[PDB]
Amino acid sequence: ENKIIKLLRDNIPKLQLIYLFGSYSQGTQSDIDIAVLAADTLDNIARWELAQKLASALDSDVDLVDLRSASTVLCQQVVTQGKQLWGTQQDDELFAVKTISMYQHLQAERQAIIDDVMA
Protein backbone atom coordinates (compact mmCIF):
# COMPACT_ATOMS: atom_id res chain seq x y z
CA GLU A 1 0.00 0.00 0.00
CA ASN A 2 3.02 2.23 0.58
CA LYS A 3 5.61 3.28 -2.05
CA ILE A 4 2.89 3.14 -4.72
CA ILE A 5 1.64 6.11 -2.69
CA LYS A 6 5.23 7.40 -2.36
CA LEU A 7 5.91 7.56 -6.09
CA LEU A 8 2.44 9.10 -6.30
CA ARG A 9 3.80 11.78 -3.90
CA ASP A 10 6.84 11.88 -6.21
CA ASN A 11 5.16 12.37 -9.60
CA ILE A 12 3.06 15.30 -8.36
CA PRO A 13 5.90 17.39 -6.84
CA LYS A 14 8.37 16.56 -9.62
CA LEU A 15 5.76 17.68 -12.16
CA GLN A 16 4.53 20.74 -10.23
CA LEU A 17 7.76 22.34 -8.92
CA ILE A 18 10.54 23.78 -11.05
CA TYR A 19 14.05 22.88 -9.84
CA LEU A 20 13.12 20.26 -7.27
CA PHE A 21 15.93 19.56 -4.78
CA GLY A 22 14.52 17.07 -2.27
CA SER A 23 11.31 15.48 -1.04
CA TYR A 24 10.74 14.31 2.54
CA SER A 25 8.17 12.32 4.49
CA GLN A 26 8.00 13.76 8.00
CA GLY A 27 5.15 12.99 10.41
CA THR A 28 4.10 9.33 10.62
CA GLN A 29 3.28 6.33 8.43
CA SER A 30 -4.80 9.30 8.04
CA ASP A 31 -2.41 12.27 8.10
CA ILE A 32 0.58 13.04 5.86
CA ASP A 33 3.33 15.61 6.45
CA ILE A 34 5.55 16.41 3.45
CA ALA A 35 8.55 18.74 3.20
CA VAL A 36 10.21 19.91 0.00
CA LEU A 37 13.20 22.00 -1.09
CA ALA A 38 13.65 23.83 -4.39
CA ALA A 39 15.97 26.41 -5.91
CA ASP A 40 13.25 29.04 -5.37
CA THR A 41 10.77 29.78 -2.62
CA LEU A 42 7.21 28.60 -3.21
CA ASP A 43 4.18 30.87 -3.37
CA ASN A 44 1.96 30.64 -0.30
CA ILE A 45 -1.25 29.99 -2.24
CA ALA A 46 0.34 27.97 -5.05
CA ARG A 47 1.87 25.65 -2.45
CA TRP A 48 -1.38 25.25 -0.52
CA GLU A 49 -3.28 24.70 -3.78
CA LEU A 50 -0.75 21.99 -4.59
CA ALA A 51 -0.98 20.66 -1.03
CA GLN A 52 -4.75 20.35 -1.43
CA LYS A 53 -4.09 18.70 -4.79
CA LEU A 54 -1.83 16.19 -3.03
CA ALA A 55 -4.53 15.67 -0.38
CA SER A 56 -7.11 14.93 -3.10
CA ALA A 57 -4.89 12.57 -5.10
CA LEU A 58 -4.35 10.74 -1.81
CA ASP A 59 -7.09 10.26 0.80
CA SER A 60 -5.60 12.08 3.81
CA ASP A 61 -4.83 15.69 4.64
CA VAL A 62 -1.43 16.93 3.47
CA ASP A 63 0.85 19.61 4.93
CA LEU A 64 3.29 20.71 2.23
CA VAL A 65 6.22 22.61 3.76
CA ASP A 66 8.54 24.97 1.89
CA LEU A 67 12.00 24.27 3.32
CA ARG A 68 13.33 27.54 1.86
CA SER A 69 10.95 29.47 4.15
CA ALA A 70 10.13 27.12 7.05
CA SER A 71 11.18 27.85 10.62
CA THR A 72 14.47 26.56 11.99
CA VAL A 73 12.73 24.35 14.57
CA LEU A 74 10.56 22.78 11.87
CA CYS A 75 13.64 22.15 9.71
CA GLN A 76 15.31 20.35 12.61
CA GLN A 77 12.20 18.19 13.05
CA VAL A 78 12.53 17.15 9.40
CA VAL A 79 16.23 16.23 9.58
CA THR A 80 15.54 14.36 12.86
CA GLN A 81 12.42 12.35 11.97
CA GLY A 82 12.13 12.00 8.21
CA LYS A 83 12.63 9.94 5.07
CA GLN A 84 14.24 11.18 1.86
CA LEU A 85 12.12 10.21 -1.14
CA TRP A 86 13.72 12.08 -4.05
CA GLY A 87 16.86 14.10 -4.66
CA THR A 88 20.60 13.63 -4.43
CA GLN A 89 22.67 12.98 -1.29
CA GLN A 90 25.04 15.96 -1.51
CA ASP A 91 22.01 18.25 -1.37
CA ASP A 92 20.65 16.27 1.59
CA GLU A 93 23.88 16.65 3.57
CA LEU A 94 24.13 20.31 2.56
CA PHE A 95 20.67 20.87 4.06
CA ALA A 96 21.38 18.88 7.24
CA VAL A 97 24.66 20.53 8.23
CA LYS A 98 23.02 23.87 7.45
CA THR A 99 20.01 23.26 9.69
CA ILE A 100 21.83 21.51 12.55
CA SER A 101 24.42 24.29 12.78
CA MET A 102 21.70 26.96 12.53
CA TYR A 103 19.78 25.08 15.21
CA GLN A 104 22.71 24.93 17.64
CA HIS A 105 22.94 28.72 17.27
CA LEU A 106 19.19 29.21 17.73
CA GLN A 107 19.23 27.11 20.91
CA ALA A 108 21.86 29.52 22.24
CA GLU A 109 19.70 32.54 21.35
CA ARG A 110 16.39 31.40 22.87
CA GLN A 111 17.48 29.36 25.91
CA ALA A 112 16.77 32.28 28.24
CA ILE A 113 13.23 32.33 26.84
CA ILE A 114 12.84 28.53 26.98
CA ASP A 115 13.84 28.47 30.65
CA ASP A 116 11.42 31.23 31.65
CA VAL A 117 8.57 29.33 29.98
CA MET A 118 9.57 25.98 31.54
CA ALA A 119 9.94 27.60 34.99
Partner: protein, 133 residues
Amino acid sequence: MNDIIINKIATIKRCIKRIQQVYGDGSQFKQDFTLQDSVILNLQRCCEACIDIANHINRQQQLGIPQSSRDSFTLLAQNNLITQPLSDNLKKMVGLRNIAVHDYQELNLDIVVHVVQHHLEDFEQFIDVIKAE
Protein backbone atom coordinates in the same frame (compact mmCIF):
# COMPACT_ATOMS: atom_id res chain seq x y z
CA MET B 1 -38.07 18.35 3.76
CA ASN B 2 -35.96 17.58 5.43
CA ASP B 3 -35.11 19.67 8.48
CA ILE B 4 -31.45 18.80 8.97
CA ILE B 5 -30.44 19.78 5.43
CA ILE B 6 -32.51 22.97 5.47
CA ASN B 7 -30.88 23.85 8.80
CA LYS B 8 -27.40 23.02 7.48
CA ILE B 9 -28.09 25.00 4.31
CA ALA B 10 -29.33 27.86 6.50
CA THR B 11 -26.17 27.73 8.64
CA ILE B 12 -23.88 27.97 5.59
CA LYS B 13 -25.72 31.15 4.60
CA ARG B 14 -25.43 32.45 8.18
CA CYS B 15 -21.68 31.80 8.29
CA ILE B 16 -21.12 33.38 4.87
CA LYS B 17 -23.12 36.36 6.12
CA ARG B 18 -20.80 36.45 9.14
CA ILE B 19 -17.52 36.06 7.23
CA GLN B 20 -18.62 38.83 4.87
CA GLN B 21 -19.37 41.08 7.86
CA VAL B 22 -16.39 40.35 10.12
CA TYR B 23 -13.80 40.46 7.33
CA GLY B 24 -15.11 43.84 6.20
CA ASP B 25 -13.30 45.52 3.34
CA GLY B 26 -10.16 43.56 4.27
CA SER B 27 -8.04 46.32 5.85
CA GLN B 28 -8.56 45.69 9.57
CA PHE B 29 -8.58 41.91 9.09
CA LYS B 30 -4.84 41.56 8.51
CA GLN B 31 -3.82 43.03 11.89
CA ASP B 32 -6.72 42.05 14.19
CA PHE B 33 -6.75 38.52 15.61
CA THR B 34 -10.33 38.89 16.85
CA LEU B 35 -11.36 39.59 13.26
CA GLN B 36 -9.23 36.66 12.08
CA ASP B 37 -10.45 34.26 14.79
CA SER B 38 -14.10 34.89 13.87
CA VAL B 39 -13.60 34.54 10.11
CA ILE B 40 -11.53 31.38 10.63
CA LEU B 41 -14.15 29.88 12.95
CA ASN B 42 -17.08 30.74 10.68
CA LEU B 43 -15.01 29.30 7.82
CA GLN B 44 -14.78 25.96 9.65
CA ARG B 45 -18.53 25.90 10.27
CA CYS B 46 -19.12 25.94 6.50
CA CYS B 47 -16.82 22.98 5.79
CA GLU B 48 -18.41 20.67 8.37
CA ALA B 49 -21.86 21.76 7.20
CA CYS B 50 -21.15 20.88 3.56
CA ILE B 51 -19.57 17.57 4.61
CA ASP B 52 -22.76 16.87 6.58
CA ILE B 53 -24.93 17.69 3.55
CA ALA B 54 -22.70 15.58 1.30
CA ASN B 55 -22.77 12.59 3.66
CA HIS B 56 -26.54 12.99 3.96
CA ILE B 57 -27.18 12.98 0.20
CA ASN B 58 -24.93 9.94 -0.23
CA ARG B 59 -26.95 8.22 2.51
CA GLN B 60 -30.46 8.98 1.24
CA GLN B 61 -29.66 7.96 -2.35
CA GLN B 62 -27.31 5.07 -1.45
CA LEU B 63 -24.51 6.54 -3.56
CA GLY B 64 -22.01 4.70 -1.34
CA ILE B 65 -20.24 4.84 2.03
CA PRO B 66 -17.83 7.82 2.14
CA GLN B 67 -14.54 6.62 3.61
CA SER B 68 -13.28 10.18 4.15
CA SER B 69 -14.70 13.69 4.11
CA ARG B 70 -13.21 14.30 0.66
CA ASP B 71 -14.50 10.95 -0.63
CA SER B 72 -18.03 12.12 0.23
CA PHE B 73 -17.76 14.89 -2.38
CA THR B 74 -16.31 12.39 -4.87
CA LEU B 75 -19.44 10.22 -4.86
CA LEU B 76 -21.61 13.26 -5.61
CA ALA B 77 -19.46 14.15 -8.61
CA GLN B 78 -19.10 10.54 -9.80
CA ASN B 79 -22.90 10.34 -9.96
CA ASN B 80 -22.85 13.72 -11.80
CA LEU B 81 -24.68 15.54 -9.00
CA ILE B 82 -21.92 18.17 -8.85
CA THR B 83 -19.39 19.07 -11.51
CA GLN B 84 -15.92 17.70 -10.88
CA PRO B 85 -14.35 21.21 -10.77
CA LEU B 86 -16.84 22.07 -8.02
CA SER B 87 -15.92 18.97 -6.01
CA ASP B 88 -12.21 19.85 -6.14
CA ASN B 89 -12.84 23.32 -4.70
CA LEU B 90 -15.01 21.88 -1.93
CA LYS B 91 -12.28 19.30 -1.28
CA LYS B 92 -9.81 22.19 -1.17
CA MET B 93 -11.91 23.43 1.77
CA VAL B 94 -11.85 20.04 3.51
CA GLY B 95 -8.18 20.69 4.22
CA LEU B 96 -9.08 24.10 5.67
CA ARG B 97 -10.09 22.59 9.02
CA ASN B 98 -6.38 22.92 9.93
CA ILE B 99 -5.93 26.71 10.05
CA ALA B 100 -7.82 26.44 13.32
CA VAL B 101 -6.52 24.20 16.16
CA HIS B 102 -3.17 25.62 15.01
CA ASP B 103 -2.19 29.21 15.76
CA TYR B 104 0.62 29.10 13.19
CA GLN B 105 -0.45 32.64 12.41
CA GLU B 106 1.26 34.45 9.53
CA LEU B 107 2.13 31.31 7.53
CA ASN B 108 -1.45 30.90 6.29
CA LEU B 109 -3.11 34.24 6.96
CA ASP B 110 -2.67 35.13 3.28
CA ILE B 111 -4.45 31.84 2.51
CA VAL B 112 -7.61 32.64 4.47
CA VAL B 113 -7.57 35.99 2.66
CA HIS B 114 -7.45 33.97 -0.57
CA VAL B 115 -10.39 31.71 0.27
CA VAL B 116 -12.45 34.63 1.60
CA GLN B 117 -11.83 36.54 -1.64
CA HIS B 118 -12.10 33.66 -4.10
CA HIS B 119 -13.75 30.60 -2.54
CA LEU B 120 -16.81 31.63 -0.50
CA GLU B 121 -18.82 31.43 -3.75
CA ASP B 122 -18.09 27.69 -3.83
CA PHE B 123 -20.39 27.25 -0.82
CA GLU B 124 -23.09 29.41 -2.41
CA GLN B 125 -22.78 27.23 -5.51
CA PHE B 126 -22.98 23.96 -3.58
CA ILE B 127 -26.13 24.87 -1.67
CA ASP B 128 -27.72 26.13 -4.90
CA VAL B 129 -27.23 22.67 -6.44
CA ILE B 130 -28.86 21.10 -3.36
CA LYS B 131 -31.87 23.43 -3.67
CA ALA B 132 -33.39 21.13 -6.22
CA GLU B 133 -35.75 19.69 -5.52
